[PDB]
Structure formats: C-alpha cells, structure tokens
Amino acid sequence: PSVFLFPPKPKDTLMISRTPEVTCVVVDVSHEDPEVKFNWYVDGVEVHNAKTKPREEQYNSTYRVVSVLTVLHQDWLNGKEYKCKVSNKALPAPIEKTISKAKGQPREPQVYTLPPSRDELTKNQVSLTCLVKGFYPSDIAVEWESNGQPENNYKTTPPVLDSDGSFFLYSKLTVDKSRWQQGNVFSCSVMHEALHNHYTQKSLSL
Amino acid sequence: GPSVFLFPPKPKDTLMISRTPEVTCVVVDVSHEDPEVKFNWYVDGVEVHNAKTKPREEQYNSTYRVVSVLTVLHQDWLNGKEYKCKVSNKALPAPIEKTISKAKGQPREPQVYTLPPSRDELTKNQVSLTCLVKGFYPSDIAVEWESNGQPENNYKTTPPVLDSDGSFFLYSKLTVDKSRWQQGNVFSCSVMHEALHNHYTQKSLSL
Ligand SMILES: *[C@@H]1O[C@H](CO[C@@H]2O[C@@H](C)[C@@H](O)[C@@H](O)[C@@H]2O)[C@@H](O[C@@H]2O[C@H](CO)[C@@H](O[C@@H]3O[C@H](CO[C@H]4O[C@H](CO)[C@@H](O)[C@H](O)[C@@H]4O[C@@H]4O[C@H](CO)[C@@H](O)[C@H](O)[C@H]4NC(C)=O)[C@@H](O)[C@H](O[C@H]4O[C@H](CO)[C@@H](O)[C@H](O)[C@@H]4O[C@@H]4O[C@H](CO)[C@@H](O)[C@H](O)[C@H]4NC(C)=O)[C@@H]3O)[C@H](O)[C@H]2NC(C)=O)[C@H](O)[C@H]1NC(C)=O
Ligand SMILES: *[C@@H]1O[C@H](CO)[C@@H](O[C@@H]2O[C@H](CO)[C@@H](O[C@@H]3O[C@H](CO[C@H]4O[C@H](CO)[C@@H](O)[C@H](O)[C@@H]4O[C@@H]4O[C@H](CO)[C@@H](O)[C@H](O)[C@H]4NC(C)=O)[C@@H](O)[C@H](O[C@H]4O[C@H](CO)[C@@H](O)[C@H](O)[C@@H]4O[C@@H]4O[C@H](CO)[C@@H](O)[C@H](O)[C@H]4NC(C)=O)[C@@H]3O)[C@H](O)[C@H]2NC(C)=O)[C@H](O)[C@H]1NC(C)=O
C-alpha cells in the first residue's frame, strides 16, 4: 500500500459550528491482504476518535481505505501534530505519516476589490476581482455574495508565495454585465485565522 | 527499477522561432548491477534518431541518472505532435514508455485586462498592479511586466486556473513603490500565447 495524510479544510477550522478533520488515505490495498489497522496520536498522546469509511474498490483492482479523525479547532490552530500509524500484511513495517499546521506568526490578509477593466465592458459578462494579500499561513477561504445570497459563478487561484514570505491569491467572480451596470453590490468574503472573528468582507459596486 | 520523467518545452520556447524548444526524458534509479540505458524516441509513433543523450551520471545515492534531449520543431509542438520516450534497461520487466504533447483542444485567445490598485491600497508604501489574463487555451502561457523598456523585478503570477467554460485564467501582480505609481509611470503587462497574433500582446497601465 501507501499512506497519505491530509489536513482539514481551512474553513472548517475557523468556525466552531463546522467540524474540521484530518484524513488518512491508504491506497494500493490488495485483495490478498485487505486488513488495514489505523492508530492515531495527537502530540504522541493516543486518541481513540477516528472512523473508517466504507472502502472503494479502485479501478486498478486495489482498495482505497480512508480513516477520518475529528480535530479540535483550537488544537489544529495551535499547531498540534497528527500522526496516523497504518498496518497491513503486505507492509514490511507500519507506515507512519504526520501533519500539522504551517509554523510561524499568522499574518492578517489585506483584501482589495477591483472592478472590471474598461476594456472588459465591451463583453456580455465582466470580471469582479478580489485580491487577498499579505496572509500567513496559506490556509484561507474566499466566497462571494450579493444581497446576502451566495454568488457561485466564481473561481479562486491557489495561494501563491510572495516575495516577503506571505501569500496572496485572487478570486474572480463573473457576472452579467447588466447586473454590474445596474449598481448591484457584490461582496468578497475572506476567512483566515489572522482576521478578527476569522472573517472579513469587502464590497464592490459601480 | 528505474523511473522516467518526461519534461515539455517551456511555453516561450515553442512560441518564438529564435528559441530552441526541447523535450527532456530523464531516467533516475538506474542501478549499478544493470546500468545500460537505451532510449528510443517517437513523434506521432514514428521513430526519430536525432535526440542527444548524455552519458550516465552517478548520484550521491549510488544510482545513475541518464538524460536524453530531443529538439522539437515549434510548429510540430503547436500542431499537437506526440513525443514518446521509451527507456529500456535490463532491470525492467518491460521498457517504460512516456508520452507528452500540448494539451488537446482548440486554442483560445487570452483576453488581457489591466487593473489599477484599489483606492484602499493607496495608504500603503507599495501598491499592486494587476494583469488579468482569461479565456485562454491551452494553459501554456508566459506573462511579464516592464516599464520604460526594462523588466520589472518584483512580480508574481498565479498558476493557470481552469475556468467554468473550459478555458484558463490567471492573474499576475506587480508590486511597485506607491511614489512610482503616483508620478504616472506607465507599466505594461505582456503576454505570450499561441492564440495571440505574433504570439504576443501587451497592455499598459498608469495613473
Ligand atoms: C537518487 O538521487 C536522484 C537524483 O537526486 C539528486 O541527488 C540525490 C542524491 C539528492 O541529492 C537529491 O536532492 C538530488 O536532486 C533522485 O532523482 C529524483 O527522483 C525523483 C523521483 O523519486 C524525481 O521526482 C520527480 O520530480 C519531478 C520534477 O523534477 C524537476 O524539478 C526538480 C526540482 O523541483 C528537479 O530536481 C528535477 O531535476 C526536475 O527539474 C526539471 O528538469 C527538467 C528537465 O531537465 C527541466 O526541463 C525543468 O526546467 C526543470 N525544472 C525545475 C523546476 O528545475 C516531478 O515532476 C515529478 O512528479 C511527478 O511524478 C510523481 C510520481 O513520481 C507524482 O507524484 C507527481 O504528482 C508528479 O506526477 C505528475 O503530475 C502531473 C500532473 O500535474 C502529470 O502531468 C504527470 O504526468 C505526472 N507524472 C507521473 C510520472 O506520474 C517527481 O516528483 C526527481 O526529479 C529526481 N531528481 C532528479 C535531479 O532527476 C532519486 O529519487 C534518488 N533515488 C533514491 C532511491 O533515493
Ligand atoms: C489505483 O487507483 C488509485 C486512484 O486512482 C491510486 O491511488 C492514488 O495513489 C497515489 C499515489 O500513488 C496518490 O497520490 C498522492 O496524491 C496526493 C494528493 O491526493 C489528493 O488529491 C488527489 C487529486 O490530486 C485526489 O485524488 C486524492 O484523493 C487526494 O484528495 C484529497 O483527499 C482528501 C479527501 O479525504 C481531502 O481532504 C482533500 O481535499 C483532497 N484534495 C484534493 C485536491 O482533492 C499527493 O499529496 C501526493 O503527493 C505527494 O506524494 C508523492 C509521492 O507519492 C510525491 O511525488 C509528491 O511530490 C507529494 O509529495 C509530498 O509533498 C511534500 C512537499 O510538497 C513533501 O514534504 C512530502 O514529503 C511529499 N511526500 C512524499 C515525497 O512521499 C500523491 O501524489 C493518490 O492520492 C491516489 N488516489 C486516490 C483517489 O486516493 C493508485 O495508486 C492506483 N494504483 C496503481 C498501482 O496503479
């Protein structure tokens, strides 16, 4: 087999109402030795909370077996280490993989909305841009709204490392030019550990 | 045994006839016991004989790394020819074949828009000049900034991102001193992509 260990989604660790989890994915499980055991540890202290998902027979005739561990928001954000220890009869010895939050001082994102270029105003749809810079760690979530309703026609770049060791990204919301021209107000919502209440919003309208 | 990585040309290299685009087939984890490596190269399945293969080089981990480089014609790559590298070695149960080409699809022309700093950014020492490039296909592209003929050092560009209509977009962010912006220096975002006339377009930005 092989073992991959995955962090929680950024949004999930920032809101207590959400449920962040670490996920341990075991691939290339054969039919001849299908028995997978998981042990989990949080800073070396064994914990007992994880659930194994119903496996998927993969299209290469191997099993994908997945364990999910719920994490405390504040444990993840304070940098605790999550160790998944995997065993299987085709493995020489148990594989461990460990994960934790990027290390270092969190830095507050600066959020800037930018209207469409004049040149773009010739098209049927236009691009509303939210630049989010100066943040650390790169874990962040960005969404758009209007009139408190999610606007879902948007795409956000991955975080990119900037020259000062912080990250930036851009999010692009596309809207019908007629919605823009009629003065509708659009909001770029940013969630990040270094924002007050883990959230901020910036408006954009004509 | 050995593992093979096959690398495409850089996007600028296939777009400018002055440049030399190359496909590079790298074999690592070649052992001492079976160190001979043989490459065979194909273009659309037809064998070609003009690659340049370098002697094996031992790595610090006591395996060999062996590289073969095939020059490609600009128009072959841009017409979607498939380049196959086949690597034979006596430790393998069968030769390893790897293939690379430009992503399949009709090319699409990048639309290039420049956007000035947000009003709110103007209380900072440095401001952000943004170039939005969208609607392009395939995703191979190059973006640069300059002012007064000279390249601007401090910019970063996002990877291409797949858009909801199947084309790509990206943004590139040039950081300048607020004073330079304020004095009306003209900056220009230049873009190179196969679906642009002369594989180039440029858009300017100033206050
Ligand atoms: C023994 O040593 C050798 C040599 O290492 C050297 O010496 C040792 C002792 C140490 O000192 C090392 O620090 C030192 O470097 C080891 O050889 C390495 O082997 C690994 C695999 O085990 C290779 O990993 C691959 O790397 C490529 C990227 O490689 C480029 O970038 C590297 C730096 O980032 C650079 O080091 C490489 O030279 C190479 O650089 C490029 O070179 C090309 C050609 O010259 C040039 O044109 C470019 O300009 C230049 N670029 C840069 C940035 O410099 C990476 O792409 C591979 O990942 C793919 O495959 C993975 C599976 O193996 C997979 O998980 C990844 O997702 C990815 O998969 C690809 O995904 C995309 C979709 O996005 C898809 O399109 C692809 O199809 C898919 N590919 C596949 C195959 O599925 C991968 O990580 C190292 O390159 C190689 N090092 C060298 C120098 O050749 C060896 O491991 C050691 N052995 C042991 C037993 O220890
Ligand atoms: C049989 O069929 C199977 C399915 O097709 C196939 O299983 C596949 O196996 C490969 C390994 O062989 C495995 O590859 C890893 O993928 C990691 C990313 O996985 C993400 O994203 C992919 C899509 O990109 C999804 O398919 C995955 O499901 C997974 O999704 C994430 O999962 C959880 C859901 O629980 C979510 O929370 C996430 O939201 C979700 N993300 C996304 C985007 O969807 C990738 O990290 C791995 O890369 C690392 O390891 C490689 C070595 O194997 C390195 O080459 C690579 O460089 C990465 O290295 C790490 O990088 C760090 C620095 O960047 C280093 O510090 C680390 O040390 C370094 N690790 C190293 C060197 O070991 C890796 O590619 C696929 O995930 C898996 N597919 C599925 C569906 O599970 C089988 O192989 C098939 N078998 C055979 C024999 O043919």
Author numbering:
A (entry chain A): 238 to 443
B (entry chain B): 237 to 443
Question: From the publication, what sentences describe this entry?
Answer:
The hFcγRI is a major immune receptor expressed on the surface of macrophages, monocytes, neutrophils, eosinophils and dendritic cells.
To evaluate the conformational changes of Fc, we determined the crystal structure of the unbound protein at a resolution of 1.80 Å. The most noticeable change consists in the rotation of domain CH2 of chain B of Fc with respect to the CH3 domain (10.7°), resulting in the opening of the apex of Fc near the hinge region by 9 Å (evaluated from the distance between the Cα of Pro329). When additional crystal structures of unbound Fc are compared with our structure, it is clear that the CH3 domains remain relatively rigid (RMSD=0.2±0.1 Å), whereas the CH2 domains are much more flexible (RMSD=2.5±1.5 Å). In the case of Fc, the comparison is straightforward, as the resolution of the crystal structures in the bound and unbound form is identical (1.80 Å), and the values of the overall Wilson B-factor are very similar to each other (27.3 and 25.6 Å2 for unbound and bound state, respectively). B-factor and tubular (sausage) representations identify the apical region of chain A of Fc (residues 265−273, 291−299 and 323−329) being the most disordered in the unbound form (B-factors>100 Å2). In addition, several residues of the lower hinge of Fc (Pro232 to Pro238) become ordered upon binding to the receptor, suggesting this region greatly influences the recognition of the receptor by Fc (see below). Although crystal-packing forces are likely to play a role in the conformation adopted by the Fc chains, these observations suggest that the Fc portion of IgG may exist as a dynamic (flexible) and asymmetric ensemble in solution, as recently reported by other groups.
